Amino acid sequence: ARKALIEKAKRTPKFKVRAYTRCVRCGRARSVYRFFGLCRICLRELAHKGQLPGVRKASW
Amino acid sequence: PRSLKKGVFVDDHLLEKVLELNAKGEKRLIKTWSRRSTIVPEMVGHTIAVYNGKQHVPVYITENMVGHKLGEFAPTRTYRGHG
Amino acid sequence: ARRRRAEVRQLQPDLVYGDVLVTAFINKIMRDGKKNLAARIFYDACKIIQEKTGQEPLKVFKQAVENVKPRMEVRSRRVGGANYQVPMEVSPRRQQSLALRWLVQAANQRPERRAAVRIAHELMDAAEGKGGAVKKKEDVERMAEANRAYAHYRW
Amino acid sequence: GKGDRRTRRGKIWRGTYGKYRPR
Amino acid sequence: IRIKLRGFDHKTLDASAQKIVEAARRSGAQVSGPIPLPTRVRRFTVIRGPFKHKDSREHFELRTHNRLVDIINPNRKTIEQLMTLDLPTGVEIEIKT
Amino acid sequence: ARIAGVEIPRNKRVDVALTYIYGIGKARAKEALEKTGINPATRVKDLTEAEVVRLREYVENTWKLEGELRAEVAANIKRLMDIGCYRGLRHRRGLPVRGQRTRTNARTRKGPRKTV
Amino acid sequence: EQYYGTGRRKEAVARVFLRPGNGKVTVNGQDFNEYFQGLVRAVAALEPLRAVDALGHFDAYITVRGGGKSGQIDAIKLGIARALVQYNPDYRAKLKPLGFLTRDARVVERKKYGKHKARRAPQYSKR
Amino acid sequence: TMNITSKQMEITPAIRQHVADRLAKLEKWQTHLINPHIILSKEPQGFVADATINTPNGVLVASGKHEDMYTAINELINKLERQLNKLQHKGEARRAA
RNA sequence: ACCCCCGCCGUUAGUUGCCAGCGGUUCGGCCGGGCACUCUAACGGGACUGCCCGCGAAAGCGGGAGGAAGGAGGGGACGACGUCUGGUCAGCAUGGCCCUUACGGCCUGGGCGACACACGUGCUACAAUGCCCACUACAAAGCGAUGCCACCCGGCAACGGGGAGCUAAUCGCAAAAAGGUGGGCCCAGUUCGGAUUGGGGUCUGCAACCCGACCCCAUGAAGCCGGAAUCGCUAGUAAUCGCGGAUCAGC
Ligand SMILES: [Mg+2]
Ligand SMILES: [Mg+2]
Ligand SMILES: [Mg+2]
Ligand SMILES: [Mg+2]
Ligand SMILES: [Mg+2]
Ligand SMILES: [Mg+2]
Ligand SMILES: [Mg+2]
Ligand SMILES: [Mg+2]
Ligand SMILES: [Mg+2]
Ligand SMILES: [Mg+2]
Ligand SMILES: [Mg+2]
Ligand SMILES: [Mg+2]
Ligand SMILES: [Mg+2]
Ligand SMILES: [Mg+2]
Ligand SMILES: [Mg+2]
Ligand SMILES: [Mg+2]
Ligand SMILES: [Mg+2]
Ligand SMILES: [Mg+2]
Ligand SMILES: [Mg+2]
Ligand SMILES: [Mg+2]
Ligand SMILES: [Mg+2]
Ligand SMILES: [Mg+2]
Ligand SMILES: [Mg+2]
Ligand SMILES: [Mg+2]
Ligand SMILES: [Mg+2]
Ligand SMILES: [Mg+2]
Ligand SMILES: [Mg+2]
Ligand SMILES: [Mg+2]
Ligand SMILES: [Mg+2]
Ligand SMILES: [Mg+2]
Ligand SMILES: [Mg+2]
Ligand SMILES: [Mg+2]
Ligand SMILES: [Mg+2]
Ligand SMILES: [Mg+2]
Ligand SMILES: [Mg+2]
Ligand SMILES: [Mg+2]
Ligand SMILES: [Mg+2]
Ligand SMILES: [Zn+2]
């Protein structure tokens, strides 16, 4: 259950609650950031490549 | 529980079936998937077959059992004890 | 730790008596960092050891200290195949530290109901030479004496 | 008692409001 | 009579305020200096590895620093040549009055 | 056996003393003392017989207490167990009734441990 | 007419306004003692002027914002100490060996990932 | 008391009990076996019996590998014994001088 | 070492932030007025064992001064060749092996929440340095346009109905709590403790039987400081008190 699942997510639901965030990049059901459309692994990956604007490693 | 401002709840696809049996007079095996459903004074005397996950459980209904939901009398877990 | 010896932390003299010793003794009454509560109680107690015994709380305090400062103590040190109770003199630093600890501790072992009272009383009895604090002190010194024997095993 | 829902101290903890802690 | 500056990069939010400061002070008349507004910080924390390893995360942030300028006594000799203004990519501009 | 079937702690405040009745807590305590006009701080030891008759009267005739309360709860569960609902199934098996975890803990309804 | 120093402590900052007078003191339009009522820590918020014979000779109008009742106290101690040294630069010695002339940078150390606070590690078990 | 994990394998209460019985060999020493832990696993190579036990003077950590699971379970024990025996008697070695 | 935060200072910057002095002051920095100060967020400065003395072949070490900071200033970011045939084919990518009206796909329902037991992490406690009601203060970092919601009202309350402000240094979440003045409890399984249960309501939600959080009445358990064993922490740390955020309809 993968592409079949990421697909069921894309489409509009039979009820309003069943809105669940998938990663747009890998399809991950869990730990998905609204602000990016990404799960935390993907999140970390692009930010590392640099393909995430303003996003840098925080040191404090 | 479920808010009082909203309406005491039945699935519609059951409520009609309940009452289709009021016209002709009871009583049928009502196989159901509706544990979600309250028991209603219009349900008394009936024997609705409640689905627990595996089985449609034969359940008789009475006076004392009105406020509760449909899933209470088709319990879901089998447990004869430990060892 | 391993390398150089640690430095004695310097206390900010208290805003009533300006006594370095007094500061420490409060913080020993201090629980959960709630210092003011503890500060209250010390002073509360002085209120009591002034009325209940008519002269300087302060003076009574430093006497309860000199009377609970243990002079020799034992420090366990295995020689061969037995753990020996080895007699040693307590560093000046440590006489304080201990004498503080035991004072408060002895106190909380008492039946009068407010902490404010006990710290007074214990500090009262111990100032003369009585008191459950001194009982700990007295004991620590007998342990030393009795074991005068094993004192060339001092380091 | 930081867990007794029925007190001032309690509704602070459980992060709520009620009779024992109104707004 | 005022402009507002929102972007992710600061060498640019400062450089662009700086130039609009220079645009309307040259071109008449009064400009209330580029004011450094407090940055709103969107932070991200994330477990470093893909599976288990709970206590080794990586720390990410998204600085969105703010900037405000005022061109005080307006004088549309300025208000003209601001439609002729050179703005970098990583900054968005806001004007009201 | 005074009010309302239980002899309340004397030498205590009436408001807390009244809590020592089965069916009366901090809430109903404030309530009868307003509605019969008694200082919460007066000691049970010091109650006017008049205040006794005021206090006792309001309390016994307004709230279900002691024995009749217990039989209600009892028969409330009696049904709940006889009717055959999951709410009652746990009652019959000594188990917990509020959807809590029973793999670990669950010790107050179960009771100090039964080893294998 | 006036003397100023800036006092800081943790996230607390103290604005001190000295004006020679009966020696009286105010914090945010509120009386000194009224503001720190029941905090024994207080009387050494006014401390550095005692290091220079100045208790009653100056008044104090004081603003303070941020931090807590005590770091605030501390910053005041810095701020009043600051101002007496502008007013009177021959006041270096007789305030600096008392350390008043400095600002302890001891702030909250950061909560770190994998720990429970700054330093309290989580409890583990070999067996 | 005593715990056993069967990692990515299915095992029986028989097999479990035998393992209880095997660790008993350690009981000899008459020190406390505190929360002993056995983990049984299958490598490609054969099985693996892990063990980690705290006793008042230290811990036992061991690993037996063998084509036979039971043999692996014993080798586990042989190593544990050794450790424990050294744990109980390394003290006495230096009594004099 | 070069990067970030905090610590001191200067430059630039003055609203939505600041208010020292004048004027009003509708009694709200509310307005005039100003950027002093506070701050804000950018740019530099500064500390280098440089100076002094001594010990030193030297590197360095001991110590005093000046300074906000002194010997690595406190914290962070950063982790060598490699090790554990360490972890992940269930994030993903992927060789190969395997399924093909099914080992794929859709849905309702159940399960992932089971409970004789054992272990790990933790919350709240066992109380008077304490518990409760009242009244009175002082943070910071964040979030907030089917969002945060002032304030008005019905409500014991959860909440509900109205309804203003804010793309937010303005408007809101917001109360910070410990703490402070006061009053009750008077050593009791209690005014400790808040589990368990009965009953009545609120909200989210197509739906809270399984299985949601919340309020109120009632119930008011175990528990009197914990065996063997054993964890953390060297300073703004440990301890203790509250606050936000992510994910999220709710939890
Ligand atoms: Mg895939
Ligand atoms: Mg959802
Ligand atoms: Mg998701
Ligand atoms: Mg003792
Ligand atoms: Mg209570
Ligand atoms: Mg507590
Ligand atoms: Mg963890
Ligand atoms: Mg009661
Ligand atoms: Mg539950
Ligand atoms: Mg359960
Ligand atoms: Mg700052
Ligand atoms: Mg005071
Ligand atoms: Mg902290
Ligand atoms: Mg291993
Ligand atoms: Mg050997
Ligand atoms: Mg300036
Ligand atoms: Mg050196
Ligand atoms: Mg480095
Ligand atoms: Mg492997
Ligand atoms: Mg895969
Ligand atoms: Mg594959
Ligand atoms: Mg399904
Ligand atoms: Mg389910
Ligand atoms: Mg699970
Ligand atoms: Mg926990
Ligand atoms: Mg009881
Ligand atoms: Mg009680
Ligand atoms: Mg549910
Ligand atoms: Mg008991
Ligand atoms: Mg007791
Ligand atoms: Mg303990
Ligand atoms: Mg404790
Ligand atoms: Mg022990
Ligand atoms: Mg260390
Ligand atoms: Mg919180
Ligand atoms: Mg949130
Ligand atoms: Mg949420
Ligand atoms: Zn992803």
CATH of the domain at A34: 4.10.830.10
Q: Which of C116, C117, C115, C137 is nearest to C126 (CA)?
A: C137
Q: Report residue C50 as tokens.
A: 């002034």
Task: Tell how far the Cα of A29 is from the centroid of ligand 21, in angstroms.
Answer: 21
Nearest residue: Cα versus C1' of I4: A59
Q: Kindly identify which residue of chain E lies nearest to residue A33, measuring between CA atoms.
A: E44
Q: Is C99 exposed, middle or buried (0-12, 13-18, 19+ CB in 10 A)?
A: buried
Number of H helices, E strands in chain G: 2, 5
Domain C1-155 has CATH 1.10.455.10: yes
Task: For Cα atoms C55, C56, C62, give the angle at the middle one, nearest 5 degrees.
Answer: 125
Residues of G with CB below 8 A from C39's CB? 40-41
Over H6-64, what HEC string results?
EECCCCCHHHHHHHHHHHHHHHHHCCCCEEEEEEEEECCCCEEEEEEEEECCEEEEEEE
Method of structure determination: X-ray
Which amino acid type is present at position F49? E
Q: Are F79 and F47 in contact (CB under 8 A)?
A: no
Q: Cβ neighbours of residue C53 under 8 Å, at least 6 residues apart?
A: C60, C124
DSSP bridge pairs for E66: E6, E37
Q: Cβ neighbours of residue H8 under 8 Å, at least 6 residues apart?
A: H41, H42
Within a 10 A sphere around the Cβ of C145, how many other Cβ atoms?
10
Pairing of strands E57-71, E31-47: antiparallel
Dist CA E29 CA E23 (whole Å) = 10
Dist CA G125 CA H54 (whole Å) = 10
DSSP bridge pairs for E60: A57, E44
Which amino acid type is present at position A42? C
Half-sphere exposure of B25 (CA within 13 A, CB side): 0
Q: Report residue G70 as tokens.
A: 């005590």
Q: Which of G117, G120, G52 is nearest to G85 (CA)?
A: G52
Alpha carbon distance, N-terminus to C-terminus of chain F: 47
Nearest residue: Cα versus C1' of I174: D23
CA distances from C94 to C90, C135, H39, H63 (A): 6, 18, 49, 48
Pairing of strands C72-74, B56-60: unpaired
CA distances from G90 to C112, F59, G58, G76, G93 (A): 54, 80, 17, 21, 7
Q: Which helix (H) or strand (E) holds F60?
A: helix F49-62
Q: Report residue E82 as tokens.
A: 């601001």
Dist CA C143 CA F90 (whole Å) = 62
Write down which chains contact chain F via at least 3 CB pairs under 8 A. Answer: B
Q: Cβ neighbours of residue G108 under 8 Å, at least 6 residues apart?
A: G10, G118
Any idea of the CA torsion for C105, C108, C112, C113, to the nearest 10 degrees? 150
Nearest residue: Cα versus C1' of I216: D19
| Domain range enclosing A56 | 1-60
Please name the nucleotide lying closest to F26, CA to C1': I191
Q: Which helix (H) or strand (E) holds G13?
A: strand G12-20
* CATH (residue range G1-127): 3.30.230.10
Resolution (Å) of this entry: 3.2
Q: Are H47 and H66 in contact (CB under 8 A)?
A: yes
Task: For Cα atoms E37, E39, E43, give the angle at the middle one, nearest 5 degrees.
Answer: 170
* CA to C1' distance (Å), from E66 to I148: 21
Q: Report residue C75 as tokens.
A: 């420090």
Pairing of strands A55-57, E57-71: antiparallel
Dist CA F79 CA B63 (whole Å) = 11
Alpha carbon distance, N-terminus to C-terminus of chain E: 4
Dist CA B46 CA B55 (whole Å) = 18
Q: Is C79 exposed, middle or buried (0-12, 13-18, 19+ CB in 10 A)?
A: exposed
Domain assignments of chain C as residue spans, ordered by start: 1-155
Q: Kindly identify which residue of chain E lies nearest to residue A55, measuring between CA atoms.
A: E62
Provide the number of structural domains found in chain A.
1
Mapped onto helix, strand or coil, the DSSP state of residue C20 is: helix
CA distances from A26 to B25, C52, E60, F94, G84 (A): 57, 78, 20, 48, 65
Helices (H), chain C: 20-27, 35-51, 57-66, 92-108, 115-128, 132-146
Domain assignments of chain B as residue spans, ordered by start: 1-83
Number of H helices, E strands in chain B: 1, 3
CA distances from C139 to C37, C99, C144 (A): 32, 13, 9
Whether CB of B23 is under 7 Å from strand I: the answer is no
Mapped onto helix, strand or coil, the DSSP state of residue F72 is: helix
Place of tokens 């050891």: C49
Domain assignments of chain G as residue spans, ordered by start: 1-127
**Helices H13-23 and H69-89, packing angle to 10 deg:** 30
Over B35-50, what HEC string results?
CCCECCHHHCCCEEEE
Q: Report residue G100 as tokens.
A: 């008043």
Q: Of F79, F87, F116, which is closest to B72 when you measure between CB atoms?
A: F87
Q: Which of F10, F55, F63, F50 is nearest to F32 (CA)?
A: F55
Dist CA F8 CA F17 (whole Å) = 6
CATH architecture of structural domain B1-83: 2-Layer Sandwich (3.30)
Q: Report residue D16 as tokens.
A: 């709520």
CA distances from G18 to C107, G2, G47, G86 (A): 46, 6, 14, 11
Q: Which helix (H) or strand (E) holds G36?
A: none
Dist CA F3 CA B69 (whole Å) = 41
Dist CA G17 CA H74 (whole Å) = 83
Is the peptide bond between H14 and the residue preceding it cis, with omega within 30 degrees of 0? no
Q: Which of H50, H46, H58 is nearest to H79 (CA)?
A: H50
Rama region for F95: left / alpha / beta (φ>0; ψ in -120 to 50; rest): beta
Strand I bases within 7 angstroms of protein beta carbons: 3-9, 12-16, 19-21, 37-43, 62, 65-69, 73-78, 86-88, 90-92, 104-111, 113-125, 128-134, 137-143, 146, 156-159, 167-169, 174, 176-181, 184-187, 190-199, 201-222, 228-244, 246-249
Q: Cβ neighbours of residue F50 under 8 Å, at least 6 residues apart?
A: none
Is the peptide bond between C24 and the residue preceding it cis, with omega within 30 degrees of 0? no
Dist CA C76 CA C86 (whole Å) = 6
Q: Kindly identify which residue of chain E lies nearest to residue G113, measuring between CA atoms.
A: E55
